[PDB]
Paper text:
S-SAD phasing was applied to determine the structure of the N-terminal domain of the ectodomain of [name] envelope glycoprotein E1 (HCV nE1). The HCV envelope glycoproteins E1 and E2 are located on the surface of the virions and are responsible for binding of the virus to the host cells and membrane fusion. Although HCV is a major global health problem, its mechanism of fusion is still not known owing to the lack of structural knowledge of these two glycoproteins.
Author numbering:
A (entry chain C): 15 to 52, 68 to 80
B (entry chain A): 0 to 53, 67 to 77
Write the structure that this text describes.
Amino acid sequence: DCPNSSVVYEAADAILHTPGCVPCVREGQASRCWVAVTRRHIDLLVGSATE
Amino acid sequence: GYQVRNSSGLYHVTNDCPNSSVVYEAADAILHTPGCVPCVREGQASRCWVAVTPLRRHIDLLVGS
Ligand SMILES: *[C@@H]1O[C@H](CO)[C@@H](O)[C@H](O)[C@H]1NC(C)=O
Ligand SMILES: *[C@@H]1O[C@H](CO)[C@@H](O)[C@H](O)[C@H]1NC(C)=O
């Protein structure tokens, strides 16, 4: 449905299907997280930005 | 934490994941994005731009294996 941006959609889906808490550690503005996929896991760095 | 005074009473709320809030925010924003989130391979990861629901702010993220 949305194939070239899939990797994100997979991650986003894993965050929602995480019943617990996604473990994150803040790196200034951005926070580094480890999302487990239902072994393997997704590494993600998320941050906010303003123009 | 912090308190809330809504229509159903007086409450006290504590975020069980204070550092994980942007992740949940982004995950929601990706699903509410009607188009497709613009990604680019940036190394061994994927650099994406997520527009947040409304000085215009967005969410930058990198996903990897
Ligand atoms: C939140 O981030 C800070 C700074 O990276 C870290 O010291 C702390 O342990 C983190 N807290 C949680 C609940 O993950
Ligand atoms: C009451 O405030 C609390 C905390 O935000 C929430 O659990 C509850 O659903 C709110 N109720 C309404 C009607 O806003």
